[PDB]
Amino acid sequence: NLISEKCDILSILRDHPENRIYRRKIEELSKRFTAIRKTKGDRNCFYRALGYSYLESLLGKSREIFKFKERVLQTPNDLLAAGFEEHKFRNFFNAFYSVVELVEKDGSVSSLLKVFNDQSASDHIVQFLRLLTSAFIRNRADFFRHFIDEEMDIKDFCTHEVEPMATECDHIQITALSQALSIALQVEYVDHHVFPEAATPSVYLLYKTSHYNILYAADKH
Numbered sequence: 037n038l039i040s041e042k043c044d045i046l047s048i049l050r051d052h053p054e055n056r057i058y059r060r061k062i063e064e065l066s067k068r069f070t071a072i073r074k075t076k077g078d079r080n081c082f083y084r085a086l087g088y089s090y091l092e093s094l095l096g097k098s099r100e101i102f103k104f105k106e107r108v109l110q111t112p113n114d115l116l117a118a119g120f121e122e123h124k125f126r127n128f129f130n131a132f133y134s135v136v137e138l139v140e141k142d143g144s145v146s147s148l149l150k151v152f153n154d155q156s157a158s159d160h161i162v163q164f165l166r167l168l169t170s171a172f173i174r175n176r177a178d179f180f181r182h183f184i185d186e187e188m189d190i191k192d193f194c195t196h197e198v199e200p201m202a203t204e205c206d207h208i209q210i211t212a213l214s215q216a217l218s219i220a221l222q223v224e225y226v227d228h229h230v231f232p233e234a235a236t237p238s239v240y241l242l243y244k245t246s247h248y249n250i251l252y253a254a255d256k257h
Contacts, residue, residue, distance in 0.1 A: 037076075037153045038075065038076045038084060038152060038153050038155070038158055039073055039074075039075055039076075039084065039085075039088055039149060039152050039153055039250075040073045040074035040075070041073065042071035042072070042073055042252060043071065043072055043073070043074070044066075044071070044072075045062065045065055045066040045069055045070070045071065045072055046062065046063075046066055047072070048062050048065075048072065048226075049062050055226075058226050058227055061226060061227070062226070065224065065226075065242070065251070067254075068253065068254060068255075069224075069240070069251045069252060069253055069254060070252050070253070070254035071251070071252040072242060072249050072250065072251055072252070073089075073249060073250040073252075074249050075088075075247075075248060075249055075250065077247050078202065079201075079202040079203060079204050080159070080162045080201060080202060081247055081248050081249075082204075082205040082209070082210060082241075082248045083162045083165040083166060083169075083205070083213070084152065084158065084161075084162055085241055085248045085249065085250050086165070086210075086213065086214070086219065086221065086239055086241070086248075087132075087152075087161055087162070087165050088148070088149070088152045088250070089238075089239045089240075089241070089250045090217070090219055090238055090239050091135060091136070091139050091148060092145060092148060093238040093239065094139055094238075095139060095143055095144070095145060095148070096143060101136075101139060101140050104136065104217075105136055105137075105140060107217065107218065108132065108133060108136055109133075111129065111168060111171075112125070112129060114168065114171045114172060114175060114216070115129075115167060115168070115171045117171070117175055118170065118171035118172075118174040118175050119174065120167060120171060125164070125167050127160065128160050128161075128163045128164035128167060129164060131157055131160035131161055131164060132160075132161055132164040132165070134157075135148070135151050135152075135157075135161060138151065159201065162201065163201060165213060166198055166199055166200075166201070167199060168213065168216050168217075169198050169209055169212045169213045169216060170194040170195075170198040170199045170212075171216075172212045172213070172215065172216040173190065173193070173194050173198060173208070173212050174190065174191065174194050176212075177190045177191075180208060180212065183207075183208050184208075193208075197209075198212075204246055206228075207228070207229040207231075210223075210231070219238060219239060220234045220235070220236060220237040220238055220239070221234065221237055221238075221239045221240075221241065222234040222237040222239070222240045222241070223240075223241050223242075223243050223248075224240060224241065224242045224243065224251060225242075225243050225244075226242060226243065226244035227244065240252070240253060
């Protein structure tokens with residue numbers, strides 16, 4: 037499946053024999069986190085992980101859901117301001133928005149996970165999040181241009197490394213999407229620019245070999 041059920045932290049070792057060199061780190065994670073979900077490794081897992089994990093965190097939080105829904109409703113304007121024609125992002129927006137309404141009206145983890153495990157609806161959701169990232173980059177080109185070579189074109193970067201499905205993310209894309217959606221994200225690293233520890237993150241991800249899974253904090257008891 038695209039997004040797994042919750043499993044033990046220590047399952048990162050017991051499975052995967054490659055992972056035994058990082059046993060002490062995995063054991064320290066096991067004291068701060070209580071679970072991990074696995075995402076398929078298809079070059080889209082940053083977008084799929086962040087989008088699932090963030091929408092999961094909103095379940096049952098009326099006022100957070102309210103404010104997120106209002107931001108997502110403004111997203112067509114970011115897209116249009118970036119140069120995308122309504123014609124082209126429409127179906128991706130609709131699919132994203134329909135998961136936000138599931139969150140708001142259904143409110144259940146199992147229905148959410150069912151959308152994110154449906155290849156088609158889930159890839160639309162990814163493609164939305166990618167176009168949003170690209171829009172955000174392009175509308176803030178004066179900032180994001182400092183992250184690539186001064187003779188490279190930020191627009192090429194969006195066209196080739198952000199918009200197409202199955203292009204791996206890197207720090208630019210993670211910074212752009214998180215800022216676009218106002219997500220407080222903490223990335224943990226099992227073993228080129230680290231992400232900071234967050235105050236009260238809604239999403240924790242575990243990074244290893246350019247792949248992202250989702251962590252759940254035992255910030256508790």
